Amino acid sequence: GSSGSSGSVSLVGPAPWGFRLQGGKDFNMPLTISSLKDGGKASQAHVRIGDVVLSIDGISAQGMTHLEAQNKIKACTGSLNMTLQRASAAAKSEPVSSGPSSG
DSSP, X not given: OOOOOOEEEXXXXXXXOXXXXXXXXXXXXXXXXXXXXXXXXXXXXXXXXXXXXXXXXXXXXXXXXXXXXXXXHHHOSSEEEEXXXXXXXXXXXXXXXXXXXXX
């Protein structure tokens, strides 16, 4: 059903995986998925905006600036191996509403 635990992913692209990066130490924030392309690799890997990159190419993206993480990404040409961070449950359900009728 629903679950949320660490896990790595793999992308296939010379660089333009379709996803971007935003934040960093220089930014004063964690590395998150800036944007993504229509049904892009990242998307194909079920990557939503806000996903935090725990690692980049097996490297720790803890003490790495935006440029850094970007540098690594640039390093990767074949595939991109990075880890994401889970956050609570990733599923929402909208309840249906209805009203009675007058006689």
